[PDB]
Amino acid sequence: KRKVVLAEQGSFYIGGRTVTGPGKFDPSKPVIPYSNEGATFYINQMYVNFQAPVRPRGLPLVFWHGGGLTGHIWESTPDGRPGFQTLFVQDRHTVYTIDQPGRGRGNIPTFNGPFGQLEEESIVNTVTGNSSKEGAWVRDRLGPAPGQFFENSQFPRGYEDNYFKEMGFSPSISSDEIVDAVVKLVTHIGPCVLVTHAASGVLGMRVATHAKNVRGIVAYEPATSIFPKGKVPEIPPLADKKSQIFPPFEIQESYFKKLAKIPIQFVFGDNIPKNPKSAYWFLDWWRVTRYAHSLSLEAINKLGGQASLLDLPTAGLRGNTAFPFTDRNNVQVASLLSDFLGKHGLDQN
Amino acid sequence: KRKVVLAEQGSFYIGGRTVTGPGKFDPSKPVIPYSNEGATFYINQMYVNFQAPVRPRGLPLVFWHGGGLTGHIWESTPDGRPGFQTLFVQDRHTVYTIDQPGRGRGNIPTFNGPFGQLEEESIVNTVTGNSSKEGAWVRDRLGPAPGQFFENSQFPRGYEDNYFKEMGFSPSISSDEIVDAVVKLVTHIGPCVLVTHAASGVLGMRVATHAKNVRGIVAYEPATSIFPKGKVPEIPPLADKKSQIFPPFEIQESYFKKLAKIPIQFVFGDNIPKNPKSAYWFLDWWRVTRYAHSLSLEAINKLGGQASLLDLPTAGLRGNTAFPFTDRNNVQVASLLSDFLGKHGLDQN
Numbered sequence: 001k002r003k004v005v006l007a008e009q010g011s012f013y014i015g016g017r018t019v020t021g022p023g024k025f026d027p028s029k030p031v032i033p034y035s036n037e038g039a040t041f042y043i044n045q046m047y048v049n050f051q052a053p054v055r056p057r058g059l060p061l062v063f064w065h066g067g068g069l070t071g072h073i074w075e076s077t078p079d080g081r082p083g084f085q086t087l088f089v090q091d092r093h094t095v096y097t098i099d100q101p102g103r104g105r106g107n108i109p110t111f112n113g114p115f116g117q118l119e120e121e122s123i124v125n126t127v128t129g130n131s132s133k134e135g136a137w138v139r140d141r142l143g144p145a146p147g148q149f150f151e152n153s154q155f156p157r158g159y160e161d162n163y164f165k166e167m168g169f170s171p172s173i174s175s176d177e178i179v180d181a182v183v184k185l186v187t188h189i190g191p192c193v194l195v196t197h198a199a200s201g202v203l204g205m206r207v208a209t210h211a212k213n214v215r216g217i218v219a220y221e222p223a224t225s226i227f228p229k230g231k232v233p234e235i236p237p238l239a240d241k242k243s244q245i246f247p248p249f250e251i252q253e254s255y256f257k258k259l260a261k262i263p264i265q266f267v268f269g270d271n272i273p274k275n276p277k278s279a280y281w282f283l284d285w286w287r288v289t290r291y292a293h294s295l296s297l298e299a300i301n302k303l304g305g306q307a308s309l310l311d312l313p314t315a316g317l318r319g320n321t322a323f324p325f326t327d328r329n330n331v332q333v334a335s336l337l338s339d340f341l342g343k344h345g346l347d348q349n
Numbered sequence: 350k351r352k353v354v355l356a357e358q359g360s361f362y363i364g365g366r367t368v369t370g371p372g373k374f375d376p377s378k379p380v381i382p383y384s385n386e387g388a389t390f391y392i393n394q395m396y397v398n399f400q401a402p403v404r405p406r407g408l409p410l411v412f413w414h415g416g417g418l419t420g421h422i423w424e425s426t427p428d429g430r431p432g433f434q435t436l437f438v439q440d441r442h443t444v445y446t447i448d449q450p451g452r453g454r455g456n457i458p459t460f461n462g463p464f465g466q467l468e469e470e471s472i473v474n475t476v477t478g479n480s481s482k483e484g485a486w487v488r489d490r491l492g493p494a495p496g497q498f499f500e501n502s503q504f505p506r507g508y509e510d511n512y513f514k515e516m517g518f519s520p521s522i523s524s525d526e527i528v529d530a531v532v533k534l535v536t537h538i539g540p541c542v543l544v545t546h547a548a549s550g551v552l553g554m555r556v557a558t559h560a561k562n563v564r565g566i567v568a569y570e571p572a573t574s575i576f577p578k579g580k581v582p583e584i585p586p587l588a589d590k591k592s593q594i595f596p597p598f599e600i601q602e603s604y605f606k607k608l609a610k611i612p613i614q615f616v617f618g619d620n621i622p623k624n625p626k627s628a629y630w631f632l633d634w635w636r637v638t639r640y641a642h643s644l645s646l647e648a649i650n651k652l653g654g655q656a657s658l659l660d661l662p663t664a665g666l667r668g669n670t671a672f673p674f675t676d677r678n679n680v681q682v683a684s685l686l687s688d689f690l691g692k693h694g695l696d697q698n
């Protein structure tokens with residue numbers, strides 16, 4: 001159960017670009033304090049870790065953390081149980097885990113000067129945003145309010161400090177450049193499966209439309225829905241009559257159609273309400289967001305697709321949060337992922 | 350051999366504190382855009398990865414990256430060869446790699462507002478500093494000027510982009526809080542050996558004075574020297590007759606004396622000039638910095654210690670950069686680390 005046998009492991013950087021400061025670099029002049037003079041900076045590169053089993057079977061999996069997270073969430077649960085990285089190497093797949101540009105070991109583009117600014121150019125915004133513990137608690141559906149847990153909870157209660165410590169801010173790197181780095185990784189790896197989460201859901205759908213090597217997608221609790229341009233369906237506002245879900249991403253139909261060529265599964269945990277819930281903003285947000293995803297999957301299927309929505313409670317798993325792959329039943333969640341890979345032959349050579 | 354057999358692996362967060370925004374959190378109100386209202390933020394925590402072999406021998410090793418780096422540098426070289434993590438798990442040690450607070454998967458303390466600012470409080474400075482490619486090239490002694498290599502260089506040429514992509518800024522978290530996180534890790538681990546690098550050199554020395562579990566230190570190319578308070582020896586300026594090395598860190602002699610109780614080795618690569626070199630600021634900086642460290646080690650030995658300076662060229666290894674553990678001969682560098690561990694019984698149970 002904890003033992004893992006690796007034919008090889010390692011990490012590397014991929015993607016990104018360079019930006020430059022003014023002037024020329026003189027090696028005879030004091031190098032410290034650092035200057036933008038004569039400077040070349042590498043920005044927006046992505047960190048990638050890989051672990052390959054002996055005699056892998058089927059396609060490599062690329063695990064893509066959600067918003068404000070890192071590859072840690074696939075390594076271990078907050079209470080130190082094996083994450084999906086270990087579980088899937090044991091299941092004979094080569095496993096890639098990434099820290100996308102702007103997160104963890106990915107690049108945070110800043111220089112000498114106010115955060116994100118290279119002389120007169122704003123690479124990323126100096127003003128940041130970041131969730132609180134309280135905002136994350138309700139976002140991830142630990143309970144309806146901070147400190148509270150849903151009755152059926154699979155959260156590793158007692159490890160709240162570990163869990164919230166894994167979360168942080170993201171600088172304003174364009175989503176285009178985040179997608180670009182993962183497209184480059186997919187080109188490097190070859191045929192593979194993307195396993196996404198929350199904010200990376202929409203990004204992985206975009207990658208698949210740019211990269212035929214994506215042979216399947218499993219998206220845990222995706223945060224933003226995707227539709228063909230001009231064909232976003234009517235989506236209701238939230239129960240507070242004022243808020244809405246995240247504006248759906250729209251792509252050209254030629255690209256959207258590529259989503260119909262591969263198996264796609266969206267996976268949702270528990271405690272998303274059926275009915276409007278004005279007292280709990282994020283619970284209601286999830287209700288309408290899941291609804292929008294159901295319509296997005298239907299649009300894919302009408303174009304010939306193989307898109308499905310898996311509600312974990314319907315599979316007999318109760319109490320999952322928005323991070324089902326780190327919950328107490330994450331081994332059963334992993335079993336359902338293995339089932340999907342087996343159904344489509346993505347676990348065979 | 351790239352193969353590794355792990356009895357267990359994983360990662361966790363340790364250390365840090367919390368800061369709070371004003372006001373109250375209302376779950377009925379829109380949670381996004383994120384707000385500091387009612388907010389608790391976890392700040393300055395550290396990420397820790399571990400890999401344990403089957404039947405470990407001796408003490409666990411804690412690999413601590415240098416300035417602007419992450420645990421990536423111990424995982425793989427820029428050209429994809431195994432890093433010290435793999436080499437030492439194969440050498441039957443449990444291996445811990447960290448991303449210290451402010452770097453990689455460690456926390457970057459920022460909120461909703463200008464970078465590093467929580468309402469009226471500056472947690473870290475909004476203005477950042479960061480080396481350029483050019484500054485890092487000369488800092489790490491790839492050659493005397495950017496784009497030029499020493500003839501004897503052990504750097505993995507052709508993988509320059511990959512190498513510089515691993516480097517980034519650090520927010521202004523106090524060194525006290527970085528040391529605090531590692532002291533807490535050392536308390537958690539038990540007896541262990543610190544393996545440091547550059548900026549982490551002085552920090553590891555400080556950790557040892559606070560944590561009796563540190564049973565040995567190997568420091569690759571440490572950047573800041575350490576002395577008892579009031580006993581900093583005369584250190585010359587640089588050849589430019591204007592610049593100085595990093596101000597040596599001073600600690601109370603009762604803490605400094607703890608450094609005499611454990612074996613300590615500082616390891617330096619090649620191409621550090623013996624004589625004043627005014628044309629090449631960072632080469633001359635290393636000349637005087639290495640000299641200051643020699644004096645520091647001497648001070649430890651005058652207190653009954655066992656502190657040594659290992660110049661890799663004297664051991665038959667030519668051309669090493671300031672990252673000997675990722676250079677082309679990093680297996681031979683690793684062998685010298687094994688030799689130190691074996692001499693001092695740190696590879697025995």
Ligand SMILES: COC(=O)c1ccccc1S(=O)(=O)NC(=O)Nc1nc(C)cc(C)n1
Nearest residue numbers: 066067068129139198199223246381382383
């Ligand atoms: C792991 O949890 C999630 O991934 C996740 C899950 C659900 C919702 C949101 C996220 S998030 O963290 O990615 N946060 C954001 O998307 N931030 C954000 N989005 C918009 C549209 C506007 C603003 C101001 N902030």
Ligand SMILES: COC(=O)c1ccccc1S(=O)(=O)NC(=O)Nc1nc(C)cc(C)n1
Nearest residue numbers: 032415416417488546547548549572573595
């Ligand atoms: C990997 O390379 C190094 O670690 C490394 C190696 C040599 C010199 C500097 C660094 S650095 O990157 O840490 N850069 C810094 O800016 N450090 C620093 N600067 C000041 C002004 C004071 C102090 C104490 N440290």
